Design a binder for this molecule. Structure first.
Ligand code: MG
Ligand code: MG
Ligand code: MG
Ligand code: MG
Ligand code: MG
Ligand code: MG
Ligand code: MG
Ligand code: MG
Ligand code: MG
Ligand code: MG
Ligand code: MG
Ligand code: MG
Ligand code: MG
Ligand code: MG
Ligand code: MG
Ligand code: MG
Ligand code: MG
Ligand code: MG
Ligand code: MG
Ligand code: MG
Ligand code: MG
Ligand code: MG
Ligand code: MG
Ligand code: MG
Ligand code: MG
Ligand code: MG
Ligand code: MG
Ligand code: MG
Ligand code: MG
Ligand code: MG
Ligand code: MG
Ligand code: MG
Ligand code: MG
Ligand code: MG
Ligand code: MG
Ligand code: MG
Ligand code: MG
Ligand code: MG
Ligand code: MG
Ligand code: MG
Ligand code: MG
Ligand code: MG
Ligand code: MG
Ligand code: MG
Ligand code: MG
Ligand code: MG
Ligand code: MG
Ligand code: MG
Ligand code: MG
Ligand code: MG
Ligand code: MG
Ligand code: MG
Ligand code: MG
Ligand code: MG
Ligand code: MG
Ligand code: MG
Ligand code: MG
Ligand code: MG
Ligand code: MG
Ligand code: MG
Ligand code: MG
Ligand code: MG
Ligand code: MG
Ligand code: MG
Ligand code: MG
Ligand code: MG
Ligand code: MG
Ligand code: MG
Ligand code: MG
Ligand code: MG
Ligand code: MG
Ligand code: MG
Ligand code: MG
Ligand code: MG
Ligand code: MG
Ligand code: MG
Ligand code: MG
Ligand code: MG
Ligand code: MG
Ligand code: MG
Ligand code: MG
Ligand code: MG
Ligand code: MG
Ligand code: MG
Ligand code: MG
Ligand code: MG
Ligand code: MG
Ligand code: MG
Ligand code: MG
Ligand code: MG
Ligand code: MG
Ligand code: MG
Ligand code: MG
Ligand code: MG
Ligand code: MG
Ligand code: MG
Ligand code: MG
Ligand code: MG
Ligand code: MG
Ligand code: MG
Ligand code: MG
Ligand code: MG
Ligand code: MG
Ligand code: MG
Ligand code: MG
Ligand code: MG
Ligand code: MG
Ligand code: MG
Ligand code: MG
Ligand code: MG
Ligand code: MG
Ligand code: MG
Ligand code: MG
Ligand code: MG
Ligand code: MG
Ligand code: MG
Ligand code: MG
Ligand code: MG
Ligand code: MG
Ligand code: MG
Ligand code: MG
Ligand code: MG
Ligand code: MG
Ligand code: MG
Ligand code: MG
Ligand code: MG
Ligand code: MG
Ligand code: MG
Ligand code: MG
Ligand code: MG
Ligand code: MG
Ligand code: MG
Ligand code: MG
Ligand code: MG
Ligand code: MG
Ligand code: MG
Ligand code: MG
Ligand code: MG
Ligand code: MG
Ligand code: MG
Ligand code: MG
Ligand code: MG
Ligand code: MG
Ligand code: MG
Ligand code: MG
Ligand code: MG
Ligand code: MG
Ligand code: MG
Ligand code: MG
Ligand code: MG
Ligand code: MG
Ligand code: MG
Ligand code: MG
Ligand code: MG
Ligand code: MG
Ligand code: MG
Ligand code: MG
Ligand code: MG
Ligand code: MG
Ligand code: MG
Ligand code: MG
Ligand code: MG
Ligand code: MG
Ligand code: MG
Ligand code: MG
Ligand code: MG
Ligand code: MG
Ligand code: MG
Ligand code: MG
Ligand code: MG
Ligand code: MG
Ligand code: MG
Ligand code: MG
Ligand code: MG
Ligand code: MG
Ligand code: MG
Ligand code: MG
Ligand code: MG
Ligand code: MG
Ligand code: MG
Ligand code: MG
Ligand code: MG
Ligand code: MG
Ligand code: MG
Ligand code: MG
Ligand code: MG
Ligand code: MG
Ligand code: MG
Ligand code: MG
Ligand code: MG
Ligand code: MG
Ligand code: MG
Ligand code: MG
Ligand code: MG
Ligand code: MG
Ligand code: MG
Ligand code: MG
Ligand code: MG
Ligand code: MG
Ligand code: MG
Ligand code: MG
Ligand code: MG
Ligand code: MG
Ligand code: MG
Ligand code: MG
Ligand code: MG
Ligand code: MG
Ligand code: MG
Ligand code: MG
Ligand code: MG
Ligand code: MG
Ligand code: MG
Ligand code: MG
Ligand code: MG
Ligand code: MG
Ligand code: MG
Ligand code: MG
Ligand code: MG
Ligand code: MG
Ligand code: MG
Ligand code: MG
Ligand code: MG
Ligand code: MG
Ligand code: MG
Ligand code: MG
Ligand code: MG
Ligand code: MG
Ligand code: MG
Ligand code: MG
Ligand code: MG
Ligand code: MG
Ligand code: MG
Ligand code: MG
Ligand code: MG
Ligand code: MG
Ligand code: MG
Ligand code: MG
Ligand code: MG
Ligand code: MG
Ligand code: MG
Ligand code: MG
Ligand code: MG
Ligand code: MG
Ligand code: MG
Ligand code: MG
Ligand code: MG
Ligand code: MG
Ligand code: MG
Ligand code: MG
Ligand code: MG
Ligand code: MG
Ligand code: MG
Ligand code: MG
Ligand code: MG
Ligand code: MG
Ligand code: MG
Ligand code: MG
Ligand code: ZN
Lengths: 100, 64, 107, 149
RNA sequence: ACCCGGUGAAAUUGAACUGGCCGUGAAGAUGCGGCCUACCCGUGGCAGGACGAAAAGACCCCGUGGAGCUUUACUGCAGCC
RNA sequence: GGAUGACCCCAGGCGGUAGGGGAGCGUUCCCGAUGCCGAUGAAGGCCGACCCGCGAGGGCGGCUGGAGGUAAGGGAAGUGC
RNA sequence: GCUGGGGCUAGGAGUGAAAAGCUAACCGAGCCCGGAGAUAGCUGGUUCUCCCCGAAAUGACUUUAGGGUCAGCCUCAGGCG
RNA sequence: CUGUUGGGAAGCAGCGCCAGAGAGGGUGAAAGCCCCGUAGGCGAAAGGUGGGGGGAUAGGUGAGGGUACCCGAGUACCCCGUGGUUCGUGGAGCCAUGGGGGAAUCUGGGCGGACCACCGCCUAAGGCUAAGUACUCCGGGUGACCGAUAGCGCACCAGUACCGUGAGGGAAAGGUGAAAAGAACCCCGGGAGGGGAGUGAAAUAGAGCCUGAAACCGUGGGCUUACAAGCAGUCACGGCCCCGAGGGGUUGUGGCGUGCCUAUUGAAGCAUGAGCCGGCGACUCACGGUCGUGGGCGAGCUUAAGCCGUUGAGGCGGAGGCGUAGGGAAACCGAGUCCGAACAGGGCGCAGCGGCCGCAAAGUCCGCGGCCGUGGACCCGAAACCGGGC
RNA sequence: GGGGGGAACCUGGGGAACUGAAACAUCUCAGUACCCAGAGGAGAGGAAAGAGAAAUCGACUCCCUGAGUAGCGGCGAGCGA
RNA sequence: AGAUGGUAAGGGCCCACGGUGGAUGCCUCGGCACCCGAGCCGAUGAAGGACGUGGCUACCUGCGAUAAGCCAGGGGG
């Protein structure tokens, strides 16, 4: 119930964003950084980036404003700790399966 | 370590559905020849232990 | 196993921090146990000496004070810029320091 | 909603009682223990659930009753649990011991006995026993009692 | 022992600005009442008091505390039959 | 009264040992924190006749000190002599 | 008789011209370490603040009597009214 | 990289850049980019390991029929004495065996709680056997672990000094500064010590070194005190001194006034404890229970060990537990049941709110708090008892 | 080939008492403390003359659970498959 | 006749500065806990020691009359 409510809380604030895939991010921080900017993440707000894509996680993991997770790892402290929630659809799929 | 059930209590007493404690009337183990029939008969029933005493016995029976 | 020294006697170093920031000089000495280098004419101090056979007339001498090695940067002999050092393997294949700005050996 | 906002509801986290910490607390000095005697001592009294100051206890003066069992212990015999018709309300078609275990009605390792509280429902109910009134309600409602053995 | 030079402890010590009487007070008061007496601070001396110091009374009792000892206390063991 | 613990008004209670209960203060540590305060001076110390608080305390100022400290809200205890 | 040197006998054990003497400055059972944080119904001590309430020193029973169990008496929460 | 303040930049400011690396530690203060690192990678001639891969070797493998040769001996078995098991002599079997007696070879033997029968289970008196398990002298990683009275007894040359014949006991004791630049030389002094000079951002950072509290000792100043009666204060007024219709310090006179803690019926008590100061110093934790409480789900609630994942990420796991029915010594019956001849009497039991929806709830899980049980269980203290040694 | 050492761990051979039972003897503490032997990186155990009711299971070891159940017990304290 | 002030041997309170002392804060070479890793040595004389050993050497470390070290492989610069 908690997992769900936390996501719900961000959803209700508009702070939850689902994404189809990640453009050019192939493991480089500058690559993620580009994409991120382009997606409205200027790094002025902390992001819990959740995706099963290892290449996208490495690329984002060193950013001070980004916390990264595999979808199996999603948990409420991390959601609540960060200002903005960003998910793969595939990530979002498992979370739906998890809160079922 | 877990509490142990007190075996003298388990052997003398029963906790009823609503948690009263029930035991056999004392006093007809012996010396009964001169006891009336009203006496022997009445001592043949169960009685309900006085609240504070039952309450203590109940705590010795943690898993009934 | 050995202290890592990025600088040596007597390549030419920039002193990048402290009172003498900006100075350039040869490394007269490297003291690895103390993690320190002596740079020529950098960090001068006035030491008192007793009137002694070694120093009659007594008074004072100037000594070079050691610098924490991290304050010091080798200057590349090719480009003349202060640099971080990289390692490059030769064909030998001995390894050597090379400037990190251009690719020049530092010896 | 953020980490600074996470709060337990009022009363969810009460402070502990600390004794032996000064006069203002009103639990200083004796630490609410009163003065002297066994109960104030470290280690305290005997099991106040039982012991009564040396006189024979309330418990030990009451008669033992019934079969207390002997080595080598409990005699293995089949065990029955009753579930009433009313608990069968929720099912359609067939009920068997196994389904009833799953519903969290029948405990494992007990036999099924159907009992009479409630109404019968035209179901095929398979069990190890039925009460007189269960059989009656069940036959009458056009359900089908099936004995197992 | 005393005085002067040298060196320099101790137990004890709630703090003290620490008198007498007659009373009072947990029943023997420098510390309370009323009176009496009394300028400040020492040195050598005396031992009546500070229920002076030392030692959580050794007597006495209490503890379902200990220990040594005894016996036709109880129960056991060695040993002996 | 107003709607709700905003605060105003009227009335009444408020000696206290064992002890029950309530509300708080402060100490170490964790999340808050890749943050924030900090050599134009951390903690700590010494002053203060000032400010807030019933109080435990908390501020502010001066001097010392010379490198750390750590909010609102929560969490946990080797927490107050 | 006294005495040097070299030896032997010890803990419920030695040794004792006998005092329960002596067995490394306290022996009616040596010392060390361990069980061990023995047990202590006894004595002592028990540390910040404010606020409300507020006892008992009785009865019964008790190898009990300065200790307990229950009850009486205090306090909190819920209900009744 | 530059500028700036500064003894020092890593602070502040300007303009950049890396990131599979923004873990962390250093560098004169506070640094992703200066140093050491970190992510990601790479590496053994020699010794060790090698539970993985490969190979070899030892070793392994039939069916009727007949025969009735073999199938673990002071053994089974029975009795006596004991131990082990939950079993304390119990109806006491089983496993083991100190004593006595003492077999059989499958038509043999042991077992299923005395014994007997029946029905089954298993093959004693020879041996070995990885792994899953325990531990931590050793190496490493990590802490809502300590931070020099703490943390190991020991941060330091400590099982040391010292104590003890011995076994054995067993301490204290960390910090100049960024850098020794650790104060040349002069002056007083035998020296120690100091005063200058000098170094340093700072020297009441000068080595008897960061900070430098308190008790304690002193110098200097303000007020006060030699006719006064005292738990040492307090209230009032006045004098003097200080900072500037107010405060502060001081205290002459007048009023009032029996220390603190402890224990007690009752203490200032001539009853306990305390010389003073600083530091250490006593109601906790686990597991169970009981109530209360904050939530989740609710005829249901919940998982344990483990497994997968993570590397401060969670999930899976339903075995099991509590609840859903009670009554009865039990057989047993069951919204009843027990006593009883009883269709008697009795004991103990059984029976939400609103508009199918929502709300509440049995119950149960988790958190929190009070108290209880088991543990040393609030801390400190015996005299003693026992083991092994000296 | 042995001998001797090794912090815990392990098996085997021996094996207390305080304490608890609010006294105490059976009982408890506890097969613990401790002594001894032996191993080893583990040790032990291990391939049914088993379990025990299922017409079943299938060496041993270790964890969870079964379960504070069954029982044991001056049927006390407690002990506990 | 009356009445009132300056005495301080010394003492008391307050303020300033020191001395003594080593609290407090900060610090950490060390400790602690858990987890992982790893786990026997010895007659080829162990564990653990004694005495030695430096040009000058009290101690510690290291080492053994070949004595702060000898030979060789690897690493490193
Ligand atoms: Mg990040
Ligand atoms: Mg963050
Ligand atoms: Mg009777
Ligand atoms: Mg009788
Ligand atoms: Mg009878
Ligand atoms: Mg009879
Ligand atoms: Mg008659
Ligand atoms: Mg009668
Ligand atoms: Mg009659
Ligand atoms: Mg149960
Ligand atoms: Mg029940
Ligand atoms: Mg290198
Ligand atoms: Mg420059
Ligand atoms: Mg090379
Ligand atoms: Mg708490
Ligand atoms: Mg208090
Ligand atoms: Mg209270
Ligand atoms: Mg009170
Ligand atoms: Mg007190
Ligand atoms: Mg007490
Ligand atoms: Mg109390
Ligand atoms: Mg209490
Ligand atoms: Mg008390
Ligand atoms: Mg009392
Ligand atoms: Mg007391
Ligand atoms: Mg008492
Ligand atoms: Mg009491
Ligand atoms: Mg006590
Ligand atoms: Mg105790
Ligand atoms: Mg006690
Ligand atoms: Mg009696
Ligand atoms: Mg039973
Ligand atoms: Mg049908
Ligand atoms: Mg003279
Ligand atoms: Mg003299
Ligand atoms: Mg005084
Ligand atoms: Mg006087
Ligand atoms: Mg009188
Ligand atoms: Mg008198
Ligand atoms: Mg007087
Ligand atoms: Mg007075
Ligand atoms: Mg008087
Ligand atoms: Mg008077
Ligand atoms: Mg007089
Ligand atoms: Mg005199
Ligand atoms: Mg006298
Ligand atoms: Mg005298
Ligand atoms: Mg006196
Ligand atoms: Mg006297
Ligand atoms: Mg006396
Ligand atoms: Mg005295
Ligand atoms: Mg004493
Ligand atoms: Mg006495
Ligand atoms: Mg006495
Ligand atoms: Mg006597
Ligand atoms: Mg007496
Ligand atoms: Mg006596
Ligand atoms: Mg007695
Ligand atoms: Mg008594
Ligand atoms: Mg006695
Ligand atoms: Mg005795
Ligand atoms: Mg004889
Ligand atoms: Mg009022
Ligand atoms: Mg009131
Ligand atoms: Mg009043
Ligand atoms: Mg009051
Ligand atoms: Mg209240
Ligand atoms: Mg409270
Ligand atoms: Mg606050
Ligand atoms: Mg505090
Ligand atoms: Mg607090
Ligand atoms: Mg911490
Ligand atoms: Mg942080
Ligand atoms: Mg920080
Ligand atoms: Mg700033
Ligand atoms: Mg500065
Ligand atoms: Mg300043
Ligand atoms: Mg701090
Ligand atoms: Mg602080
Ligand atoms: Mg203050
Ligand atoms: Mg300050
Ligand atoms: Mg720092
Ligand atoms: Mg904080
Ligand atoms: Mg906070
Ligand atoms: Mg929180
Ligand atoms: Mg404490
Ligand atoms: Mg002789
Ligand atoms: Mg001799
Ligand atoms: Mg002799
Ligand atoms: Mg002899
Ligand atoms: Mg001897
Ligand atoms: Mg001996
Ligand atoms: Mg003895
Ligand atoms: Mg004797
Ligand atoms: Mg003895
Ligand atoms: Mg003798
Ligand atoms: Mg003689
Ligand atoms: Mg005599
Ligand atoms: Mg001796
Ligand atoms: Mg002697
Ligand atoms: Mg004795
Ligand atoms: Mg002696
Ligand atoms: Mg020993
Ligand atoms: Mg013990
Ligand atoms: Mg203890
Ligand atoms: Mg005793
Ligand atoms: Mg306390
Ligand atoms: Mg009142
Ligand atoms: Mg009385
Ligand atoms: Mg009474
Ligand atoms: Mg009577
Ligand atoms: Mg009674
Ligand atoms: Mg009393
Ligand atoms: Mg008593
Ligand atoms: Mg009571
Ligand atoms: Mg009343
Ligand atoms: Mg009420
Ligand atoms: Mg400058
Ligand atoms: Mg710069
Ligand atoms: Mg910048
Ligand atoms: Mg990282
Ligand atoms: Mg960092
Ligand atoms: Mg860092
Ligand atoms: Mg500096
Ligand atoms: Mg910063
Ligand atoms: Mg910082
Ligand atoms: Mg850095
Ligand atoms: Mg790596
Ligand atoms: Mg690496
Ligand atoms: Mg054949
Ligand atoms: Mg044959
Ligand atoms: Mg055979
Ligand atoms: Mg044989
Ligand atoms: Mg036998
Ligand atoms: Mg036995
Ligand atoms: Mg029996
Ligand atoms: Mg048996
Ligand atoms: Mg035999
Ligand atoms: Mg056969
Ligand atoms: Mg046969
Ligand atoms: Mg047999
Ligand atoms: Mg047999
Ligand atoms: Mg049989
Ligand atoms: Mg069998
Ligand atoms: Mg069998
Ligand atoms: Mg074997
Ligand atoms: Mg294997
Ligand atoms: Mg194994
Ligand atoms: Mg391990
Ligand atoms: Mg380690
Ligand atoms: Mg620290
Ligand atoms: Mg220290
Ligand atoms: Mg220490
Ligand atoms: Mg310190
Ligand atoms: Mg150590
Ligand atoms: Mg030390
Ligand atoms: Mg030493
Ligand atoms: Mg001695
Ligand atoms: Mg000695
Ligand atoms: Mg000793
Ligand atoms: Mg000490
Ligand atoms: Mg330093
Ligand atoms: Mg230094
Ligand atoms: Mg000179
Ligand atoms: Mg001279
Ligand atoms: Mg000098
Ligand atoms: Mg001078
Ligand atoms: Mg000088
Ligand atoms: Mg200067
Ligand atoms: Mg400055
Ligand atoms: Mg200073
Ligand atoms: Mg300083
Ligand atoms: Mg000092
Ligand atoms: Mg410093
Ligand atoms: Mg200082
Ligand atoms: Mg000083
Ligand atoms: Mg001072
Ligand atoms: Mg003066
Ligand atoms: Mg006069
Ligand atoms: Mg006068
Ligand atoms: Mg006055
Ligand atoms: Mg007036
Ligand atoms: Mg004034
Ligand atoms: Mg005045
Ligand atoms: Mg005044
Ligand atoms: Mg007046
Ligand atoms: Mg007085
Ligand atoms: Mg009075
Ligand atoms: Mg007081
Ligand atoms: Mg006292
Ligand atoms: Mg007393
Ligand atoms: Mg008395
Ligand atoms: Mg009295
Ligand atoms: Mg007095
Ligand atoms: Mg008196
Ligand atoms: Mg007195
Ligand atoms: Mg006395
Ligand atoms: Mg007194
Ligand atoms: Mg007394
Ligand atoms: Mg003393
Ligand atoms: Mg003092
Ligand atoms: Mg103190
Ligand atoms: Mg408690
Ligand atoms: Mg609880
Ligand atoms: Mg609860
Ligand atoms: Mg839930
Ligand atoms: Mg609900
Ligand atoms: Mg349970
Ligand atoms: Mg009925
Ligand atoms: Mg009825
Ligand atoms: Mg609930
Ligand atoms: Mg309770
Ligand atoms: Mg314990
Ligand atoms: Mg305890
Ligand atoms: Mg407790
Ligand atoms: Mg003790
Ligand atoms: Mg003795
Ligand atoms: Mg004895
Ligand atoms: Mg004895
Ligand atoms: Mg002994
Ligand atoms: Mg002995
Ligand atoms: Mg051997
Ligand atoms: Mg061996
Ligand atoms: Mg054994
Ligand atoms: Mg043997
Ligand atoms: Mg044995
Ligand atoms: Mg053994
Ligand atoms: Mg013995
Ligand atoms: Mg005993
Ligand atoms: Mg004990
Ligand atoms: Mg007990
Ligand atoms: Mg006893
Ligand atoms: Mg006792
Ligand atoms: Mg006795
Ligand atoms: Mg006993
Ligand atoms: Mg015990
Ligand atoms: Mg035993
Ligand atoms: Mg042991
Ligand atoms: Mg051995
Ligand atoms: Mg292993
Ligand atoms: Mg093995
Ligand atoms: Mg083996
Ligand atoms: Mg076999
Ligand atoms: Mg169960
Ligand atoms: Mg019983
Ligand atoms: Mg046992
Ligand atoms: Mg005059
Ligand atoms: Mg004066
Ligand atoms: Mg004078
Ligand atoms: Mg005065
Ligand atoms: Mg000072
Ligand atoms: Mg700190
Ligand atoms: Mg090893
Ligand atoms: Mg050796
Ligand atoms: Mg040596
Ligand atoms: Mg070589
Ligand atoms: Mg080489
Ligand atoms: Zn270059």
């Amino acid at each position: 119930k908690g997992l769900a409510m936390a996501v719900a809380d961000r959803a209700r604030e508009g702070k939850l964003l689902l994404v189809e895939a990640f453009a050019g991010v192939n493991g480089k921080t500058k690559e993620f950084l580009a994409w991120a900017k382009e997606a409205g993440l200027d790094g002025s707000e902390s992001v819990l980036l959740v995706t099963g894509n290892e290449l996208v996680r490495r690329a984002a993991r060193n950013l001070p404003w980004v916390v990264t997770l595999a979808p199996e790892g999603l948990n409420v402290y991390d959601i609540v700790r960060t200002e903005r929630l960003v998910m793969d659809l595939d990530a979002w799929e498992v979370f739906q399966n998890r809160i079922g | 370590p877990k509490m142990k059930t007190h075996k003298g209590a388990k052997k003398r007493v029963k906790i009823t559905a609503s948690g009263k404690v029930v035991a056999m009337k004392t006093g007809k183990r012996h010396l009964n020849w001169q006891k009336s029939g009203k006496e022997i008969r009445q001592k043949g029933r169960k009685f309900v232990l006085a609240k504070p005493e039952a309450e203590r016995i109940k705590l010795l029976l943690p898993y009934e | 196993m050995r202290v890592k020294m990025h600088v040596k006697k007597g390549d030419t170093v920039l002193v990048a921090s402290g009172k003498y920031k900006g100075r350039v000089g040869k490394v007269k000495e490297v003291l690895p146990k103390k993690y320190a280098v002596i740079v020529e004419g950098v960090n001068i101090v006035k030491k008192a000496v007793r009137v002694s056979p070694k120093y009659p007339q007594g008074g004072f001498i100037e000594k070079e004070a050691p610098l924490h090695a991290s304050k010091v940067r080798p200057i590349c002999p090719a480009c003349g810029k202060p640099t971080r050092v990289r390692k490059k393997f030769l064909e030998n294949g001995k390894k050597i320091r090379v400037c990190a700005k251009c690719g020049g050996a530092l010896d | 909603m953020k980490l600074s906002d996470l709060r337990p509801n009022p009363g969810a986290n009460k402070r502990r009682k600390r004794v032996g910490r000064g006069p203002g607390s009103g639990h200083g000095k004796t630490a609410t223990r009163g003065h002297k005697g066994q109960k104030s001592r470290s280690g305290g009294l005997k099991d106040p659930r039982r012991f009564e100051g040396g006189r024979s206890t309330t418990l030990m003066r009451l008669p033992k009753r019934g079969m207390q069992g002997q080595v080598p212990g409990e005699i293995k015999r089949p065990r029955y649990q009753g579930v009433n018709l009313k608990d069968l309300a929720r099912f359609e078609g067939e009920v068997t011991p196994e389904l009833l275990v799953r519903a969290g009605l029948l405990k494992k390792g007990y036999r099924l006995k159907i009992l009479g509280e409630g109404e019968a429902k035209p179901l095929k109910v398979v069990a190890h026993a039925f009460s007189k009134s269960a059989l009656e309600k069940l036959k009458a409602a056009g359900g089908e009692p099936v004995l197992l053995e």
